[model samples]
Target: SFSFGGFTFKRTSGSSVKKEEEVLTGNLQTLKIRVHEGYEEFTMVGRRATAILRKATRRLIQLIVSGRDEQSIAEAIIVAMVFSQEDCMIKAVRGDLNFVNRANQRLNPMHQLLRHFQKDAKVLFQNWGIEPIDNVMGMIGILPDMTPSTEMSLRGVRVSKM
Candidate 1:
């Protein structure tokens, strides 16, 4: 699969690029012939596939943002789509959810209902583009070059002989 702009180009299962024998022999098989003959059709198919992926991604983001009960379902669907392979999907989804749960525990001292928000905030920060960082810092009223200060103090005491 290759991505250009917002579109992804994927060779169909029976296409020349997906057939190892044809690739090795440098021969144009039936699939390759069909693909060559139906270039426009394949282009449309690829565009549609990319659109489906985009829609899924958007739905996942919406679920996460809504703090909805269906976030897990949305996340699972995305994980499956991303990993595709079963074993990798299982491991990745488990790890991702575990980390989110752990981080929620750490941040939710009050044990409020906004656990997912905290988890999402961490993800947002990690994947933040320039605009997100600027917007977030602006909302927090934080300067770009801000720093915290530390001070040292000493107290003297005198002890009587024991």
Candidate 2:
């Protein structure tokens, strides 16, 4: 169940590279696919992450290869798509939700539908026995990056020094 753009995406395996290209050069939208497979492979492609947060793309891929079970990864990927930046909020209802929109100001008929899936993702994760993670941003491996903070907040614990 491979997922992206509010959908789903694969399994774990070592893989052989058929071909990989930055597919762009000299400053372009430059979408990269560090794609791989030998039956045991994980691909993490994206230009040195033009920005910091963007690393989530490449980083998540690494998490996929090394370990990170399918269930957890699925939760991360879907939450991303459902919140990915876009304004089409209603993409003919044929494609995934354009962007995240849960403000009380108003909402799209389509976004409403997409929201349902996010709820399902949470339930999906809980069944996996992993606590409700607010963000996988640091789960894969970054630093005491965002995970600690996110986790603490979720469990409603404030900090105190010893």
Candidate 3:
């Protein structure tokens, strides 16, 4: 759950919302999945669900970058929903170890999906006459540096190999 500005958002299961306005009240986010139902299992399922959500977000961003208007944006959402359902089902079948691998194994279906999305984004930008080089360089500058642990930095430089 999170709050921004004057609005507070929360997620709950099994909420009957027939209209968009209903979502603004009480639980702002609701997910109804008719599969296995256990709190512990649900937690793991959420991770896989998040991957699909992230991919959809990336697609939306790509569409916007390629100059898609509001109608295109809405259509993109519908298309993403269908694609994500199929992708997420395949991902769920792989179980938790697949999540740990993180390595983009060659010939893996999930990897293929990611690759397709990336290629689509590239083509969209090219077709729209947008130079991806500038965006790539901008991202490089803001990339996080993951080195020097907090503990090691506080202890000063010490080389111990034993």
**In terms of TM-score, how similar is model 3 to the real structure?**
0.18
- For candidate 3, the lDDT comes to 0.23
- Summarize candidate 3's per-residue lDDT along 1-162 as a digit string, tens digits: 432111122333222222111111012222222221221100001211121122221121121111123233222322332233232222222212122344654433333333333333322212222122232311211111212122321111111111
Using TM-score as the yardstick, the better of models 2 and 3 is 2
* TM-score of decoy 2: 0.22
Q: What is the lDDT of residue 126 in candidate 2?
A: 26
TM-score of each: 0.16, 0.22, 0.18
Q: Cα deviation in Å at residue 3, candidate 1?
A: 36
For residues 1-162, what per-residue lDDT tens digits would candidate 1 score against the true structure? Answer: 654322343543322221111111112111111012111111212222212222121111110011122333223223212212112212222122322455454532112112332333333212221112222211221111111112210001011111
Clashing pairs in 1: none
Ranking by lDDT: 2, 3, 1
lDDT of 2 at 30: 33
Q: Summarize candidate 2's per-residue lDDT along 1-162 as a digit string, tens digits.
A: 342333333333433443343422112323232333233332322221101112121122222211144343334433432332212211212323333444622543324434544555443222212233444543332111123343422121111111
Top candidate when judged by TM-score against the true structure: 2
lDDT of each: 0.21, 0.30, 0.23
Worst 10 residues of 3 by lDDT: 40-49
